[PDB]
Swiss-Prot record:
Species in which this protein is naturally found: Mus musculus
Inducers of expression: Expressed in a circadian manner in the suprachiasmatic nucleus (SCN) of the brain with a peak seen at ZT8.
Lineage: Eukaryota, Metazoa, Chordata, Craniata, Vertebrata
UniProt site (Interaction with DNA): 21
Subunit architecture: Forms homodimers and homotetramers. Binds DNA as a homotetramer. Interacts with AXIN1. Probably part of a complex consisting of TP53, HIPK2 and AXIN1. Interacts with histone acetyltransferases EP300 and methyltransferases HRMT1L2 and CARM1, and recruits them to promoters. Interacts (via C-terminus) with TAF1; when TAF1 is part of the TFIID complex. Interacts with ING4; this interaction may be indirect. Found in a complex with CABLES1 and TP73. Interacts with HIPK1, HIPK2, and TP53INP1. Interacts with WWOX. Interacts with USP7 and SYVN1. Interacts with HSP90AB1.
Positions where Phosphothreonine occurs in the chain: 185
Localization, UniProt: Cytoplasm; Nucleus; Nucleus, PML body; Endoplasmic reticulum
Identification of the protein by name: Cellular tumor antigen p53
Annotated region described as Required for interaction with ZNF385A, given as residue ranges: 1-187
UniProt comment concerning the protein's domains: The N-terminal and C-terminal disordered regions undergo liquid-liquid phase separation (LLPS) following homotetramerization and activation. Post-translational modifications, such as phosphorylation or lactylation affect the ability to undergo LLPS.
Region called Interaction with E4F1, residue ranges: 160-187
DNA-binding residue intervals: 3-187
Family from the record: Belongs to the p53 family.
Section covered of the full-length record: 97 to 283 of 390
Amino acid sequence: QKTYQGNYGFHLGFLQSGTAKSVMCTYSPPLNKLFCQLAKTCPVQLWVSATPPAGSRVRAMAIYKKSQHMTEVVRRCPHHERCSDGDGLAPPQHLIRVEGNLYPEYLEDRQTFRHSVVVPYEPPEAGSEYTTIHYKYMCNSSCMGGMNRRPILTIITLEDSSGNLLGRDSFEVRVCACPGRDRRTEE
Ligand SMILES: [Zn+2]
């Protein structure tokens, strides 16, 4: 999916990580793909070249990468949906959750029925040039009944208070047991 830096120069950033066997979350710049373990927090950076209007929001949503599966809503597999690992905020069917934010909104589109999690857009902290949001994926890419080995993309959109699109940028994701190993291979 095409990126849209838009009027505010919106784009994502990821900390530099290696491919060590014990790494729990590692991003690959050449593949623009995030490799992470189940339920492990992944810090994603939000960069802008100009401050967005007040009341702006940041939405995260997963879609299947391959054309033939793109219309299918991405959800947790039945097994994980019933494992009772809820934090009291996120519905059990949602794949993506946010951690460390007091204002997450777990939404379900009234027309497409796709899931997403939204948090307020907040400026970078003192002496910082990016904002960090911590995301976690509650299902493995291999989960049958779920993503079933189908690659997904995580679309991050910057929206105004009215829900209008301001910016967009995405990355592929693979939720596996050994992020370090899989990254080097795919690379
Ligand atoms: Zn699962």
